[PDB]
Amino acid sequence: ENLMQVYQQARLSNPELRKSAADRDAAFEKINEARSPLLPQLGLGADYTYSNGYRDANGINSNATSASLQLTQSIFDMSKWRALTLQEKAAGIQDVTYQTDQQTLILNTATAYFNVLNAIDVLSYTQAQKEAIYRQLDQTTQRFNVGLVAITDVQNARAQYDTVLANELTARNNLDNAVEQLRQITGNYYPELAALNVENFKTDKPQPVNALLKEAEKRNLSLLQARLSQDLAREQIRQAQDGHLPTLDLTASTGISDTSYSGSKTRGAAGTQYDDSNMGQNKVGLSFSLPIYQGGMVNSQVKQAQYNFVGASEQLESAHRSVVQTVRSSFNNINASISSINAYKQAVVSAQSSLDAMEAGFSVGTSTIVDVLDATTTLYNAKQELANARYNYLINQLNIKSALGTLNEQDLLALNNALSKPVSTNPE
Amino acid sequence: ENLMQVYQQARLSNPELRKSAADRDAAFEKINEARSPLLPQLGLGADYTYSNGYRDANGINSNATSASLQLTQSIFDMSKWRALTLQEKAAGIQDVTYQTDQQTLILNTATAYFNVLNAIDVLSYTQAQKEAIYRQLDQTTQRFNVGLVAITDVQNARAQYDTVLANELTARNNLDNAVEQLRQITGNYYPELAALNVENFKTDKPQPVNALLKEAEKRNLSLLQARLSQDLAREQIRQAQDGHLPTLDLTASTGISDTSYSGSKTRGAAGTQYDDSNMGQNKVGLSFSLPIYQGGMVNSQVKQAQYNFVGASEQLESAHRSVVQTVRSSFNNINASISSINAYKQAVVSAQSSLDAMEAGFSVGTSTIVDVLDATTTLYNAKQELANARYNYLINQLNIKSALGTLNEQDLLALNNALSKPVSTNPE
Amino acid sequence: ENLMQVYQQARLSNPELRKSAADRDAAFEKINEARSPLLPQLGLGADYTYSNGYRDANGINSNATSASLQLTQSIFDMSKWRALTLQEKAAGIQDVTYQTDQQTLILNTATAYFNVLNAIDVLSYTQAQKEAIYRQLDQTTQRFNVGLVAITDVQNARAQYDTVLANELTARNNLDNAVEQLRQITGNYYPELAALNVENFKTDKPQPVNALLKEAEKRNLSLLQARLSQDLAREQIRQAQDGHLPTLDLTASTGISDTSYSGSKTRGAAGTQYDDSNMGQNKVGLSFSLPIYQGGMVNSQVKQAQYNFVGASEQLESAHRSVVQTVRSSFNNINASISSINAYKQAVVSAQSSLDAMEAGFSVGTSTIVDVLDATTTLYNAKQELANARYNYLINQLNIKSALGTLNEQDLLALNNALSKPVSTNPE
Numbered sequence A, B, C: 001e002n003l004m005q006v007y008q009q010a011r012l013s014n015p016e017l018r019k020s021a022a023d024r025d026a027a028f029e030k031i032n033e034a035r036s037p038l039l040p041q042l043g044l045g046a047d048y049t050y051s052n053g054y055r056d057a058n059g060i061n062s063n064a065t066s067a068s069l070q071l072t073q074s075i076f077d078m079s080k081w082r083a084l085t086l087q088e089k090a091a092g093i094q095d096v097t098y099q100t101d102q103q104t105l106i107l108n109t110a111t112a113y114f115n116v117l118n119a120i121d122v123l124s125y126t127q128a129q130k131e132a133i134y135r136q137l138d139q140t141t142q143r144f145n146v147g148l149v150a151i152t153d154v155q156n157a158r159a160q161y162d163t164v165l166a167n168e169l170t171a172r173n174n175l176d177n178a179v180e181q182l183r184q185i186t187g188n189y190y191p192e193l194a195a196l197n198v199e200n201f202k203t204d205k206p207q208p209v210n211a212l213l214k215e216a217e218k219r220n221l222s223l224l225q226a227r228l229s230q231d232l233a234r235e236q237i238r239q240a241q242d243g244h245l246p247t248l249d250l251t252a253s254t255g256i257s258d259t260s261y262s263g264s265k266t267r268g269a270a271g272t273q274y275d276d277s278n279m280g281q282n283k284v285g286l287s288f289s290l291p292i293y294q295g296g297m298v299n300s301q302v303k304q305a306q307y308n309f310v311g312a313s314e315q316l317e318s319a320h321r322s323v324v325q326t327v328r329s330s331f332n333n334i335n336a337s338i339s340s341i342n343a344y345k346q347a348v349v350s351a352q353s354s355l356d357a358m359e360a361g362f363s364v365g366t367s368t369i370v371d372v373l374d375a376t377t378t379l380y381n382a383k384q385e386l387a388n389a390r391y392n393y394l395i396n397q398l399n400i401k402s403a404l405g406t407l408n409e410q411d412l413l414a415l416n417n418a419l420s421k422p423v424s425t426n427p428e
């Protein structure tokens, strides 16, 4: 399949991104658990108790039973509103983290995809290098037979074909592990992909660096998260400061008490005290609580929260600095990648006419086969180095979007258009 | 010493593995602390108090003294049985983690051991390469004297010996740091080891990949741990759900109260109220508590626990995917390693007869010393590349067992048998 | 600017080190929050309550109001002293961590600085290599015109200049990203730096290894922290053991109760019970609490704390082992670095006279231009490899200081003296 189709099938299955989602999903649900203390708490208690008097109570015994429907309600507790506020903020943070992890699926799928396309290019060039050496070995072994080439030109040539044989070997390996890379990320094995359409390919220059930098400062997810986090440390300072405020709660019960006495000093007290009591109370009440001095625990908590804010801020500076260097390095690299595709584009042309020369030269006395092998080897190196450099440009366009924070599905859709030929991932 | 003896000495001292053990030891003991709330709690409290009445109590004062032997007992508290259950599970997890760390000691000891054997092979070859160039330099300097070799053949040859001199230098360094690696891991320094017996060496083909894969899915420790962890997230969902259940505890005291009054309105009240009281109560009782509505805190806690379970599951998928690619890549690599030992086995033969030729050639005009140097350099490269590839196969056999989850002492015992010659780790 | 001036400007702005500082600052302030429970806690509570009787209380109603100024004071609570003790210890640990991070700013600033100096050296050599090939190409293209040089000597020579052209390209990239590295760390961009004064340069042999090792065992920060941490685990064992001790607190209130009754069975009870009560109590009291059996929670907690200590100890052994290998490897490396600056110092001399020869040789028939290019290429490689090796020696001097735990500003001040020539970071 093409880039799109691979990516899309990975979107639905990546246990890396699916976990990041379950983390986002929990953090948002946990807002609910944070809101809960601002709502009515409603419990039910029943307490059986048997007392047995001794000393000045030797002979007074009781079997008591109570039950109640208790209700609590926060009426003014700033600290509980703050927790709600923080859980919202943490959830927002988790969402930027998901946003970031979404992008990482894109960059990682593209990368593995091209790393396969390359493992393929490398193989097929290494096979063409092998095959080309064989034919040059069978003209250097049908000219040695005829006397006009030294035996050490054939021992060298055979030792050199044996190397391209061992190279073809650790080339498929590289390829095979590449599709294993792709499977882990993607969940699948592909019999064929779709390689970079070679003639229909031009590099597009990058936007000025100062524009990319400015766009990144508005939308780069690492930066947006450092900001949300500084925001969290500041709300956390208020939280420390809430421990100075007073709290007003409401309570309301409906209880039922059923005591009954026994023993000896109950057998004629006749004060109708030790007579069965059957109470029932409806209550509603307000507790007010004000902290006044707590060993200075509140102030130390506040100071801590403030250093935490400095730290959150330093972390933020670290973030701009990272976005700066990432956005620049990333611009720098796409430029060096364009100027590289150009140089290798020409070194292939050179390596080609340089080979063509020493094939004519060798079959007619002029230059050795060890002139023709090198010139051949040299060709296929520029051949590889080129197609490799192309892929890096493609992946470097994607890094620029990541550093920007805009890396999305469309960046993949466009890149899809620039490849077409279905290539096998398991060449015979 | 041999592989075995090194490993074994490291088993007894590795502070990496010894810590992992202390972690396992603590998690298991912590089961005890988790069981404790299901047992009887037994405290002792005595409270002296002095009251001093004012307002409608101006003149009523009291000095009271109480003490009690309190006892609590969980009778039905599902949440406390759950914690016990979870600490058992966490202990199990810690033990799979120790199991994993045990293996890592094995892979790490073997790796360092061969990294030394290689630093040694590389040195001794680099010494033989040095020594061989010296003798070829003293035949090219006893033929230059006699006129029939250009001075630039000797300037080239001396500049080239100078390089093998600098190579011998940054070869012994590599070696020395390798024994430092080994010491950190192992606690010791070895004057000699035991290198890979070179003639008594063949490669053994690996088991089919589909068999390894199937064996790994049953025993691979990383996988077993993802599973124990999914299990934990599920028990954790039940824990969230326990917050709907009621709790029944028992309590039992034996108190003693000693109040005594004073002030002015005690000096003739003659109601025998403000008379010294001396109580003593034996109690036993049952508290029952049922939550009814808690702001929906219990449900949000349950939903959270559920997303955690989704995540624990995605994590598990991630684990299969890792076991797949590890087991394949690892199979792939041992194969490419066998086919590699073969190719280098032959390139050494080639490089050898190719040298032999150009030594005869150079001492009789035919080929330069710059033909003889390269051919020599080339040999020693195959010489190294070979013994190096051998070690990689050995270490790759061990990676399969790790991916399998079976890496153990016997895998080392067998590998021990395939080495014998005691080699110095500090060559003069 | 020079090394000093860069470093110093980074000291004032590094958000990596400024964060580490905010972490240290908080840990120390948090001692305050740990001391607080040992001080007086002073609150204020007022509780309005309305009761409404039913059953044996049908017709008894009350509106009650209370307020109090409560005070608590730990009189003997070992656990609270221990917390204070641990927070002190944690703060100490955070400070060793800051000490470590301080050093890392130094090593990291120096490294980036020299990595720029090197990206510069490499560029300027790559430019001199380019420029030298051009002139040799324009004598091989004004001798081909005159017939006595094959065309394949010019196709080879142009393909080889094209390579140094592409090398110059991915050289000024390397450089540009190096200053980006430097900016992230340092906060600035420098138009010029100051490179290693090349003639005024000698290597200084290192102190014997056994001395460095002994010095490191006394002052290496990683080791000091492992020790401080072992100390924490042991204090943590005492903390576990404190759960067996009894606790004695003091309390003091000044309350005010204002009950008032209503309903029907209050309308003539005439027992002056349901008459407005107006209490007021001054209290002072001592609570004593002794744990006796807590399900063996205290003992399991202690055993756990003890395994933690074993782990903290194993961790410590891991630390010596790390300091050993770091101090040795680091000594080893500076020596191989000296012996390296020497070998490359000579290979440049060789590569120079070897070039000089084959420039005379080629302009007068003797050796090809493909003899003159290689010999040239070879010179500039030793030229680079040399200046590169020099920097590594500088940075390796700094690693010894880190492994020692003495890396400080003076180590930089001295290194500053050994450079002087202001070099541009943006060569045209």
Ligand SMILES: CCCCCCCCCCCCO[C@@H]1O[C@H](CO)[C@@H](O[C@H]2O[C@H](CO)[C@@H](O)[C@H](O)[C@H]2O)[C@H](O)[C@H]1O
Pocket (backbone or CB within 6 Å): B081, B084, B085, B088
């Ligand atoms: C003689 C040496 C003894 C050394 C240790 C002394 C400790 C005190 C004795 C405690 C008795 C053991 O308690 C026993 O342990 C296992 C572990 O839960 C329980 O087994 C159970 O465990 C978990 C709950 O905890 C459940 O999910 C499980 O399905 C269930 O089988 C038994 O229900 C219980 O009866």
Ligand SMILES: [Cl-]
Pocket (backbone or CB within 6 Å): A292, A293, A294, A295, A296, A297, A298, A299
């Ligand atoms: Cl306070």
Ligand SMILES: [Cl-]
Pocket (backbone or CB within 6 Å): B293, B294, B295, B296, B297, B298, B299
């Ligand atoms: Cl609820």
Ligand SMILES: [Cl-]
Pocket (backbone or CB within 6 Å): C292, C293, C294, C295, C296, C297, C298, C299
């Ligand atoms: Cl106990």
